[PDB]
Every structure is written in structure tokens, then in C-alpha cells.
Amino acid sequence: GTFLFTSESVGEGHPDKICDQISDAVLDAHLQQDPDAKVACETVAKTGMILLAGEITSRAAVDYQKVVREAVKHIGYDDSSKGFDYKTCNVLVALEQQSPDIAQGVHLDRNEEDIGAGDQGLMFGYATDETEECMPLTIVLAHKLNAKLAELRRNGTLPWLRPDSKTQVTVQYMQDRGAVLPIRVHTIVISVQHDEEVCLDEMRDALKEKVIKAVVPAKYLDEDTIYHLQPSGRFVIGGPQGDAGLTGRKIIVDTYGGWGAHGGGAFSGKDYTKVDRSAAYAARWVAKSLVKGGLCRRVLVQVSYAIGVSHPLSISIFHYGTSQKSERELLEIVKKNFDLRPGVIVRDLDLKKPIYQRTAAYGHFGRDSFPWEVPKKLKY
Amino acid sequence: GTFLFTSESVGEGHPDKICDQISDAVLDAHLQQDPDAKVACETVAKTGMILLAGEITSRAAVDYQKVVREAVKHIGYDDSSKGFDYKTCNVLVALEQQSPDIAQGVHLDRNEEDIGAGDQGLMFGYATDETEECMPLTIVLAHKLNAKLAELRRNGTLPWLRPDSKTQVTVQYMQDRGAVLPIRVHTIVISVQHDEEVCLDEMRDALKEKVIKAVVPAKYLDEDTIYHLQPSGRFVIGGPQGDAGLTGRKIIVDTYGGWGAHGGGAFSGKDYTKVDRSAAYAARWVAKSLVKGGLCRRVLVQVSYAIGVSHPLSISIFHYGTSQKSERELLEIVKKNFDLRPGVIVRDLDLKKPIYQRTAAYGHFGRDSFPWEVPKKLKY
Amino acid sequence: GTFLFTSESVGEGHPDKICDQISDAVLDAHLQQDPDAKVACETVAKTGMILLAGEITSRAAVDYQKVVREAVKHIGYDDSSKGFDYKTCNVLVALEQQSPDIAQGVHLDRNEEDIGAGDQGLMFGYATDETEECMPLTIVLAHKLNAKLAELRRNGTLPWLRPDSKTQVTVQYMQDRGAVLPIRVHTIVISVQHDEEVCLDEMRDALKEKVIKAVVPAKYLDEDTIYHLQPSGRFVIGGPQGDAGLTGRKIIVDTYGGWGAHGGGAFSGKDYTKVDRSAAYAARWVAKSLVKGGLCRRVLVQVSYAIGVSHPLSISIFHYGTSQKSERELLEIVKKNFDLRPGVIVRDLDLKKPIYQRTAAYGHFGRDSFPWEVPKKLKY
Amino acid sequence: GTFLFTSESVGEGHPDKICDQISDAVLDAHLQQDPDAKVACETVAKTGMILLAGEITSRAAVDYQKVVREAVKHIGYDDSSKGFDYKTCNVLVALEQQSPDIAQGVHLDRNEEDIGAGDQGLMFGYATDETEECMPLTIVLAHKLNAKLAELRRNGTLPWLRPDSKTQVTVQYMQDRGAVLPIRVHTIVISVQHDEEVCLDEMRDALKEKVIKAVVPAKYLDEDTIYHLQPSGRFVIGGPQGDAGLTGRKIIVDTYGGWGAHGGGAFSGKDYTKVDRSAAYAARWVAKSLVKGGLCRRVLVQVSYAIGVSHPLSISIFHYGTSQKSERELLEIVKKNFDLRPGVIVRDLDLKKPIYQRTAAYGHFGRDSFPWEVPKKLKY
């Protein structure tokens, strides 16, 4: 009755994640001055280049040079020896206003609570009782491995580390009436950019002893656990020099690591009127509320929207057999307890607050008690 | 016992899909001359701009100006009145060689069958017997609605249409022992870019009568079906002028429309050594082989890889309760019948052939009898 | 005793001149809000692209998209059929603050009158009594031919004209004691971008009859005058699509058409602290004052500066033998009547006023009674 | 009877000169493979960015990444501490084919000797017997000061130097029957980018003792000579980070430093069919031939062209009163001894040879016995 499942995560300096963090730094900069800024900022990164492309209508005055470079500084790309430097890279801006055709169809002259969805689309929320975070263990572990790398880089204990990293965790699970129970870690991959001087065996030893053993409980690790540590053998070239980055190319890392489902919308660089972000956050909030409220052990929530229409087109609940209530009963509970219009979600989840850069690495869910991580007490 | 499920699709001129098609036009151009080209081409589109960013190591001599502009021409952006013109747009190129650190870790000096995966990652394949295409009805219908729009644009019957479109279909389903049975279409959204002269009622009438009724069987449509046709009210500004596009931002449209699962990897712009594409195609091939072979009615396949390692790290089969065989038995059948090393997949699926631009709109699966859509006869 | 001399001019839609006008539109936009803006804006134009690159420190909030596109609109590039369209081109911005090392060395904490030169360099002013404009006839005629083309394009009498044009005029001169006396026009070149439908003979006839004869006095034209009208035979592709443009690549067209001398500094995109512009304008003002004041018939003025130093390093006067006073006496007159510190020039010539876009085609000198064209009454 | 005259030069790492050298590195790369390449390559430089924009029709396969980065390496921008790094900067390419309308009008189906001029324009050549180089002393000295800085940077004796430098020299002259005789150096400016650690007095002392005294004969220097050494006080930020660069923005530095005249055409990035380069080189060759041949002491030559026309429209000779022959007699000598069609100049001056990057700093004239610097023996 056992099965394997694998999830990955990436570090702050992974080129796609650089772009997500920059896009959200831009969003936060606008929101600091104009809580109602309309923001759709994509970022592209390649050798020596950050390009901002998209649509922003805002009363803010934002110094894009400063904002972008400070985000890259935070990540740790501060010298040409590392392959990228915030001080000397190119920052190019191709930002126009929001289309007035979109603006008139979505929000102009509308009461805030009755703003239309900013686009069509579908979104999913998921929660699982297998961890206190209500997240899959596979991705929780994958994120923590990248966070550990960044910690040891920043505190100087592994000064050969660079910011670009990836991890991948395969867990063997059993199932119990639709819920999932982690048994052991089957395989771990870690690849991380490094300096020219450190040798491969020193890196592999450090990744096992100072990273894996520091993060993963020993009860999950055994003689049979497979380790692929620096499996390429050499990773000196990294960041955008090694691989182009784009915003919204880590959408599964941002969410549930292959578990649950995804509707395809990226989060970063978007204000609350973009339901790709606000409704996915709300859907997580619903899912987590159902599990922490004791109605399910595991649950998937779908919602969908049409551009210009406030209420969701569809809502669906899938409980994997882990509730005594029918899925229809859970749907009725959700409909009685949540208002999933974007102009109400914004109020419930405080989505005009400039906290988005903090969401843009290590997953949007399962950490930091953001509003969508604080369960709603349900009435039924 | 009924539930709703929603999927979307986008047209050829949707700015993200423009980028996928350009990236794959670039890939095909390289493969026409050098079957072993290493290609990782991202495309970004905004007002007046196509930017190519990424890594290509190839013996081909490719005229990027010509290749990009011809792809945009095919899509139909051929005049400033439409918001974008292949003849006069900017084409910018930021393409470097593949990192030699990646090359040495993945493919240099390796026997082709034993080439390492081009990256780590996870991938899923899915198949469902609800349609002959072995695809969810929701996304099949969504794709066909966009294809219909392009057909009526190109044949001149709706000359006010422009290339940028989106559709979304919500189907009410029942379930039968883990399989799903479509009952009716609950809601349809269509948004499509249009000329300045046509009025809203003419468009809405045409979208119902010439698009929806031409595509969706009447047995699925009834008095209660909800239509959101041009719901924003005005969509004259479109294509990249209205919304920035990036490669790999329609990964759910490219695959299963929210059904099954996704590991996060984009397809377009990548040669076969990128397992994001080759192994996802293989996983579809496996899933479809299991369903057409009569072992399951519905099945999800996960695989995962480490950079530089040929064999998958993990393989998992989930049959939703729709097989008499256990998931472990199906896994054994898969392991006996498929070799999921990238250097074997390339041979089985003919992945050096320059057919990729054809995959880059209307989904990669469920059409055209591509090799991954021709079931393998299973021995067990 | 006769000789030939040739000068050229270009139209508003010549790609280099597009860039000069855009750079100066940006400067004017800043000056409208912040008279003390520090501006060093270069523009690059190629197919579908305007790129702004440079350094601006200003309290203004400038919408670069709007400013750039409005300048291109004014020029007349408004449709993909013309090769460039303000509505749909790419506008990319790579603008940073002025270097703080420059700012501290030039203007920070300095009394305005005692601001240092913004850079080192040399500059020349020139005037000649051969025309009332105090300009060489060769370039006056060349400019007027381009202005005529733009006039006939804009009033619809030659609707096949596009904005990109070049002209060149060769005049036969005699000399009289260092002054020059035009005798006849020896050769005229006109090349102008055109639509696909008009034939070559219609264009050549129109350029002779409606352009040349409308601009050049018949007394200068005879049986022997050589006409090279549309000499390439076909000029449908034009503007930035045909030829990349850059700011500051028409510095001889901007000034004296090969007569006098040039110190190499471009004018457009620069505020008054850049002595390339302010001191060259002042030098013209000096030269014109000497000729209109009756001291010379023709005169060349050199000045030069060091970055951070207010007073010119050198001043030189060359009168071609056309004064009864020695060059040393004229130099003394200039030193007694003009203060060529940039922080005084700014006051005398009103150089914080946003009139710069008007200078950026058809020459900076010899027209419109700008302040540097109004002679100073000299005391001696 | 004395006067001052000032000329400037810039170093290899001056951002405009970076662009000229890159443009000519691109030209040379094409010519190495295809002697008949048609090349019009502009370069733009700003923080972290080299952009190539222009038109190239060539049979060569050129790796623009490699070519650009190697040119920047040669200049010495190899670390983020210097403000720019060839290894990690962005290289963007916007290169299209030559316009076919230009190609058909200029060179297609034409006998090489009878190729038309690639454009209209005017050009000047100049020579002066005041130095053995036949160049003005002011600019010769200015160039040598920059060359000295680069020498002391590269040999490690002044390791605080960076590549970006400017110099300016003012010489007091007397005249003798139209020729000019240098008397003394009146003022020298040197500004050079430097590291954060060196102090201002150490730099000023080194610039006087190790640079000026090493280059300028002591006979020209006296108690009254004015030195402006690091006059801004601080120049740590430099190269493209401090100031945008463009190709063809140092046209007076490239030529005669304000002496003679200039027709406005840039040299770098252009093949021989662009008469801006080939005819200006030829005009220098003519001028130098007249002076070294003993006909003049100082001479200015003008030539001009029309696009598509092989022979020059006009030729003019101005000898400043320094010949016993009339200017008409010298013109007749020039016409009997030189064929100034571009398709003949190419043969006489060997202009398909890839030696152009070597021309792109320290002036195109007066050094290295390039073909246009080897006087032609005149018959008359």
C-alpha cells in the first residue's frame, strides 16, 4: 500500500525565483505609496540583465533602479565572481499603464466589494494534516533544505555557497482512508552553485552533514536513503548567467509541490484584483480552515472566475474520502462561511499590505501565519 | 454525487502562447539543421517587442529575425491596427551558449542512451477515458473554442476577430468508481480581441451561434447553461500591448486543465534532454497506454529526475480506483514496458524531429497522433 | 577664384533625428516640472524600438511611454505601412541617476553662477554674412528642402511621402577678402522615403517642381545644375527599420554643415550644465554678435572647459581676414562683453526653458530668434 | 599674432570609445570570414549593457557574445569593482539584414569599381606639417596622454587606474603664412577613473610626473602652464555606469581635434561601401600626400557623394595660403592622381582587411602607417 511522491524547491538565487522576488519588490514598492495600485509586473533575468515588462497604473513614484537592485542585493548577488552583481547589472524597464479596456471592464466606477475579477481563470487550494503546516512533507522539506543553504551562506559557515540552489525530496508514504502518512525519505537531491576553489567531496560531505542532517529528522533517514548531492559534478556558473529566469515559472514550488492541483496562474507581480493570486490565497485559506476545523484530513478546493464578474463561476470541494460529510455538504459549509469575491477577499486577507516580497521564496503557503494561513472558525 | 470542474484554454495570439510558439519555432529551426542542438529558449513579449533569452549550443545557423517574424505572421499579427505587427516589431536576442558546467554534467562524452537528465524535476502524465482523445472534456472543449475562433478569423467570416483569445469551460460531472462522466456544460466564458467597429451584441450573438454551437454538442447545452461572452465589455487593445507574455506561463493549458497534476516544468523552447518536456511526454504516453490498454479508466503517472542521472529517481502510478490491479502491479507493468531514460525516450518518441511549433498551441496532448499519443501495446 | 562647398540636412523622420527629438522631448518634459533637472538622455532607434539610455536626476515625474510616443506621433510615424508606429513600437528605458561623483564635482553646494562645467570639451560658434540668417547658404537650403518635404507630406499634396528624408546642396562660391559669396547651386541631392504605389518619375518630377523650385531661388539654378533625385531608385523601407538611429549622430547638420568647425559634442538630451550645448549656443551668440555688430563678415569662435571649472580654459577668435581689428582685439571685445561661465549663460540665454524639442530638427542655429540668435549690442 | 587652440582625446574605456571598438570588432569578425560583408553596426553601452543595433548582410557566422565580450576584456573592464565586467554584462543584439532597397541602389549587380556610394554625405581630410605625423599637436598630445594612462594601468605601475579617461590640451601657436607653429602648452586637463583607495594628491602627483612629463616635451611646459588634474575631485564611478556610450560620438577625437572640418559621418562599425569611412580615409590620404609631397604646408580637402552614385559630387581643396599653386591647380593635381570612387578606394587602401578595431581608439589618423597614412607619389 506504499507509494513514492517527489517535490522540489529552489533557492532565493534561482533565476526564476529572482524574478518572482523582483516582481513582488516592485509590487510592494507601489503598494507602500498607493494601496490601490494596479500591478502586473513580469521580470526576466539573463546574464547581466533584469528586464521589467508589464502594466502598472499607480499614483506611486517608484525608483525601479533602486528597487530592483536592492532585491538582488538581498538575494546575495553582489560581485562578478558570483556571476551577477546588483551594483553593475543592466536594469531595463518596459512598463506601460494597465490597458484602459481592462480597467473599464474590471474596476472603474465599481464599488470595491463588487470589483470584477481581473481575469478569467481557475485556482486551487489544498491542505493536508500530514504536517502541522498543513502542507505536504515533500515540499516542506525541500523548502527547508534551500533555507538552510541560504542560512549557512549568510552566516559564513559555508562561504563557498552561492545563492542559486535547487533541492528535491522523494518520500515514501502509506495511505489511511484517503489521508497520507509519511514513512521515510527515499531520495534527496541538492544542487547548489559554488565557488571555484571548493572540491566536490568537501561539498558533498557538507551537504549531507550540515544541510540534510540539520533539516530532515533522522527517523526519516536510513541506510537505504539515496543522496544525489551535486550530481552534475560542477556548478560554478549559476544564477541568470547559467539559466534564464522568468516570473511565474516556479508555480508548483510556490504552491503544493505536485500535490493537489494547479490552475496555472502565477502569483508574483500581481495586485489583489488578479484572482490568480487573491483567489488562490483564499482557496488555501478555505482548505486549511476545513482541515484545522476538523471536517477533513485532506482537501482540494477549486474556484474559477470570468473577467469583470465578481462572484466565482464555480466552487468545488474534493475531500479524498477523509470527511464524514459529503463533498456537497462541505461545499454548502464553504458557501455559508466565505465570500470569494476579490473585493471581499482583499479585506479578509489584507491584500493591499506590502508583504509580497516575503511570499516570493520558500512557498506562499505553510509559513509565517500570513492571513490565508490563519484558519477561519466555521459556522455550520 | 455531482461536481463542477473548470478548465481554460487560450488562442494562438494570447501573448503567453505567442511566446511558446516563438520558442518552439526557434527550437525547430535549430533541429532542422542540427538534430542534437541543445536549446533553452525563453521568449518575452510586450508592446512592439519580442525578446529571446536563454541558452543554445548548436551547429545550426539560424536567422532569429526571420524565424521570430514568420511565427508572428502565422499567428496573424500583421498590422499596427491589431496592436502588433511581425513586419515592424522589435526582435531582441540575448542568447548565449549552454553553460559548460551543465554540458559536462549532462551529456558530454556520454553514450546517447545514457545521457543524464538535463535538470532535476518532477513530471506527471494523465489520461481519462471520458473522451476518445483520453483528455478531460473541459479542456478539450476550451481548446476547440479557441481553434474555432482562429478558423472563423482566418476564413473571413468574422473579420472583426483578432488573434488574442481566451475561453473557459465548466462541466458538471458525475463519478463512477473513480472514473468521471460529463453530464452538461454549466458555464462558458469567451473573451476575444476585436476591432473598433463591431458592437458588443453582434459579437455576443456570433460567439454563441457561430462558435459555441459549432463546437459544443447540443446535448451538453441547456436553458440553464451560463454564458459569459465578452464579459469585460470591450477588448480592442490586446496581444502583447494589452498584457506581457512569457514562455511557459500556460503550463496547465498545455497539459490537463487542472485535472491530474503538474510538476511545474514548461515545455516550449526545450530540446529532448530537458526532461520537463521529454519525460512529461513519456508520462502521457504511459498514462494513455494504460487506459487504451484497458488496465485503467483514469490514471496519473509521476516521474522525477536528478540532473546528470539517466534513470528516473521515482515512478508512481495512481489509478483513482479504476483498475482491478493494484497500483503496485501497474507500476511493475510500467517498469517492464517502458524505459524512461531521456536518451531512450528520444528514440521511442522521435524527439529530434522539428515538430515542436505544432505542439505550442491547443495543448500538447490529445491531438494529432504525435508519438506520445500512440499507445504502446503492453506485455504482462 | 571659385570653389564648391557641400552641406547636408535630414528630415524629422531620419532615424538619428528621431532620436535627437525624443531626447529633447524627454529633456523638455523634465524641465516643465523641474527647471534644475540634470538630464543626459541618449536615444537609440531600430525596427520597432526606442531605447532611452542615460542619466537623469530630477524632481519631475515623467511618463516616458507617453513622452516618447507623442514625439514619434509628431514626426509622423503612425502606421506599420510606414515602417514605424508610435502606437505599437517598443519603448525601453535604461535611465539611472546622475553619477554622484559627477554631481559633487560639478554643481552640488555651488552657487548657480559658479557651477562648474558639466564636462571637459571644446565648442565652436560660427557666423557668416552670406545670408540674413548669418548661416552658410548650403545648409540653409538643405534644411529648407527637408522642411518643404515635411510641409507637403503634412498638407496632403504629396501623400506618398514618408517622414525619413535627406538632402544635400553643393554651392559654387567666390571669395572676397575672406568672406564668401554664393554664385549658383551646382548639385542637389534629395532622397525621401515613399509609399509602394508611387513611381519613380512622378517622384522625381515632384521633387524638382514642388520641392526644389519652391525653395531655391531660380537665380541659383541653371541648365548646368545637377539633380540627383531619388538616386537609389527605391526607398520604401525607411526610418529606423532601414537604418539604426542614435542621438548626437547629426552634429554637423545641427550646426554649420561643414563650415566653421566642431568640437564633437552633441546637443540633444542635455541640460544647460552640459557645456556641449550651453557653450556652443553661447559661442554662436558671440559669433553672430560680432557679425551683426559690423566687426567681421565671417568669424569662428572656439571655447573650451574642464569638468568642475566654471570659466572657460581658452577662448579664440578667427575672423578669416574679414575685420579691420586684429583677432586679439576681437578677443578683448568678447572678454569684455560676454561671461561664458555656464551658470551665467543659463541666465542670458534662458536655458532652463523647455524649448529644446524645437531645436532638434532643421538646425539649432539660424532660425526662430532663439536667445542665442538675438545679437548682443557690444561695448568697446 | 599668437592664438590658443584646444583639442581633446579619450581613453579606450571611455564609454563612447568602448562602443566604437565593439562596433569595429564586429566589423572585423565579419570581414575575417566574408571580405564583402555589408556592415552597419551601432553599439550602445550603459550600466551592465552592450546593445548592438544595425544592419549586417554577410556570409560570416559570428558569435556576437564572444566578439563583444573579448573587446571589453581587451579594454580592461573585467570586474564589478571597476563598474563593468565583460564576463557578466548583458549583450543584446538587434541586428537585421541590410535594407534590400539600399542594397539594390548601391551594390547589387554592380561591377565592384562602379559600386555606388553607400549613402550621401560630405567628408574632409586634413594635414598639417606641424608634426611628423602630419597632425595637429594638440590632438597628438591628447591621444598620447590617454595611451600613457593605459600603459601605466596595464604594466601595474599605477594599479589604481581604470580604463575610462579623458584628456584635453590647449597649445599656444603662432602662424607663418597660413601654417601653424606650436609655441607652448598652455593648459592640460586629465580626468581618469580610479579606485576607492587612492587619494587625490597621489593621483595628481602621478598624473603630472608619470603621465604629463613622460609624454609632453619639457620645452612646451613652463611655470605658467595650467594643470587641471582630476578637476572633479572624485571619479570612482566610470565607464558606462557613469555615462552612456554610443558609437560615433567621438568623431572629432577620431579625426583632427577641431582643426580642419568634419562632415558628420562616423567611422566605426561600417564597411568600405560607407563613404563616411572610406572617403574620409581617402581624403586624409590626399591631404597627407599634398603636404608630404611638398605642395602645401597645411591643407583641407572636401569630398561629397550621393547614394548610388560612384563618383564624388564635389571635390574642394583649401591650402590656407600655404602653396605657391592655386587651389584650382591643386584640385587638378588631385583629380589626375586619385580615383575617389569607393570601389577604387577599397583597392588602393585595402579596405576589406580586418584592421578596423585597431583604428577605434587614439585616432584614425597620424599613426601606424595604415594605407591612408602612406603618401602617394604625385605626378604633375
Ligand SMILES: C[S@@+](CC[C@H](N)C(=O)[O-])C[C@H]1O[C@@H](n2cnc3c(N)ncnc32)[C@H](O)[C@@H]1O
Ligand atoms: C539546469 S538549468 C536548466 C537548463 C539550461 N537552461 C540549459 O541550457 O541546459 C536549470 C537550473 O539548474 C541549476 N543549474 C545551473 N547550472 C547547474 C549545474 N552546472 N549543475 C546543476 N544545476 C545547475 C540552476 O538552478 C538553474 O536555474
Ligand SMILES: C[S@@+](CC[C@H](N)C(=O)[O-])C[C@H]1O[C@@H](n2cnc3c(N)ncnc32)[C@H](O)[C@@H]1O
Ligand atoms: C486580463 S489580462 C491580464 C491582467 C493584465 N496584465 C492587467 O494589467 O490587468 C490577461 C489576458 O486577458 C485577455 N485580455 C486582455 N485585455 C482584455 C480585455 N479588455 N477584456 C478581456 N480579456 C482581455 C488577454 O488574453 C490577456 O493576455
Ligand SMILES: C[S@@+](CC[C@H](N)C(=O)[O-])C[C@H]1O[C@@H](n2cnc3c(N)ncnc32)[C@H](O)[C@@H]1O
Ligand atoms: C543609407 S542609410 C545608411 C547605411 C545603412 N545603415 C546600411 O545598412 O547600408 C542612411 C540613411 O539613408 C536613408 N535611406 C535609407 N534607405 C534608403 C534608400 N533605399 N535610398 C536612399 N536613402 C535611404 C535614410 O535616411 C537612412 O537613415
Ligand SMILES: C[S@@+](CC[C@H](N)C(=O)[O-])C[C@H]1O[C@@H](n2cnc3c(N)ncnc32)[C@H](O)[C@@H]1O
Ligand atoms: C562627465 S560625463 C558626461 C555627463 C553625464 N552624462 C552626466 O550625467 O552628467 C562624460 C565623461 O566624463 C568622464 N567622467 C565620468 N565621471 C566623471 C567624474 N566623476 N569626474 C570626471 N570625469 C568623469 C567619463 O569619461 C564620462 O564618459
Ligand SMILES: [K+]
Ligand atoms: K491554482
Ligand SMILES: [K+]
Ligand atoms: K530557463
Ligand SMILES: [K+]
Ligand atoms: K508535469
Ligand SMILES: [K+]
Ligand atoms: K502577464
Ligand SMILES: [K+]
Ligand atoms: K562645437
Ligand SMILES: [K+]
Ligand atoms: K546608422
Ligand SMILES: [K+]
Ligand atoms: K569628415
Ligand SMILES: [K+]
Ligand atoms: K553620454
Ligand SMILES: [Mg+2]
Ligand atoms: Mg526555469
Ligand SMILES: [Mg+2]
Ligand atoms: Mg491565467
Ligand SMILES: [Mg+2]
Ligand atoms: Mg500570462
Ligand SMILES: [Mg+2]
Ligand atoms: Mg524545473
